[PDB]
Amino acid sequence: MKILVIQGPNLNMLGHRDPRLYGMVTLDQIHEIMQTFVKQGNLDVELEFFQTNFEGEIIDKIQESVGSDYEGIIINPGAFSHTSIAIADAIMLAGKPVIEVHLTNIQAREEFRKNSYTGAACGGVIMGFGPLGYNMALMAMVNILAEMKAFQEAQKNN
Amino acid sequence: MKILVIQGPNLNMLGHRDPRLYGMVTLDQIHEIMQTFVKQGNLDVELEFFQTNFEGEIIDKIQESVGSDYEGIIINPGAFSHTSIAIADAIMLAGKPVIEVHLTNIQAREEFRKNSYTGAACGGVIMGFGPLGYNMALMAMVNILAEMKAFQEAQKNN
């Protein structure tokens, strides 16, 4: 149960960014909290982490998810959320749960960040919880999978 | 540790609403899942529940929260999210965490639902997880409180 955690542009440079918005925490620091959340909870989730500043590297990674290894995706497309129809379209073709996270509340920054093409394509969106939103994402994905697959056995047996 | 769970217009009539959007679950059913989440986790949270179709009843309840009994609020202002500057302003004056939940993804319905005045005023927003978003809200609030108060003792002791 590989979850793929895709992180978009400039997220690797957290802790060189405005700390009023982003606190004083790094991308690596986030990803540990995420394992520490898993390791603790005792979810048989394997997390994989992939950061990139390129739109097409995101689309490729989503597309590569289409084969069996991954059961879901937690993605923060970053600033691309607001422009990238392409990443949205990739999210629409994945055949697996995608949950959108933002550290900041994108309802309360510049007007250009309000709309998320990508988040509209995902099942659900979380925003403004800082690093914590990623664990709430994990919570959700684990829950959703358990529902979907509890549901598949309950129709191949009828 | 009373959490106040405010639910807006027409949310009481879930399960007379479009089940393609809202599944086949009631408001009471949601609130049990929420206790069952608490009861289980073993959080010393007392939940209080308040539903209303009136904008001013929301603002009153938030305002009444300003005294000591409540430590946080999880609110789904519903359709008022998109119009009610007043409820937003109430949220801005509460002096306690407010987390916005929506059952549906408000990025993927009519254009009139995209913008949440109220969600911009809250710390954070969750949307599109169905009933599950309320437990992720609980998770978050519990986490946040524990952080804030772990932080108050760490400054009255310096």
Curated annotation (Swiss-Prot), chains A, B:
Record-linked Pfam families: DHquinase_II
Pathway noted in the entry: Metabolic intermediate biosynthesis; chorismate biosynthesis; chorismate from D-erythrose 4-phosphate and phosphoenolpyruvate: step 3/7
Signal peptide (from-to): none
A biological process from GO: chorismate biosynthetic process
InterPro entries, alphabetized: DHquinase_II, DHquinase_II_CS, DHquinase_II_sf
Gene3D superfamilies with a match to the protein in the record: Dehydroquinase, class II (3.40.50.9100)
Disulfide bonds: none
SUPFAM superfamilies for the chain: Type II 3-dehydroquinate dehydratase
Annotated positions binding substrate: N76, H82, D89, L103, T104, R113
Keywords of the record: Amino-acid biosynthesis, Aromatic amino acid biosynthesis, Lyase
Lineage top rank: taxon: Bacteria
Swiss-Prot/TrEMBL catalytic activity: 3-dehydroquinate = 3-dehydroshikimate + H2O
Statement: the UniProt record of this protein carries the keyword Amino-acid biosynthesis: yes
GO molecular function: 3-dehydroquinate dehydratase activity
Top-level class of the enzyme under EC nomenclature: lyase
Site, as annotated: Transition state stabilizer: R17
UniProt EC number: 4.2.1.10
Biological role stated in the UniProt entry: Catalyzes a trans-dehydration via an enolate intermediate.
Subunit structure: Homododecamer.
Protein name, entry field: 3-dehydroquinate dehydratase
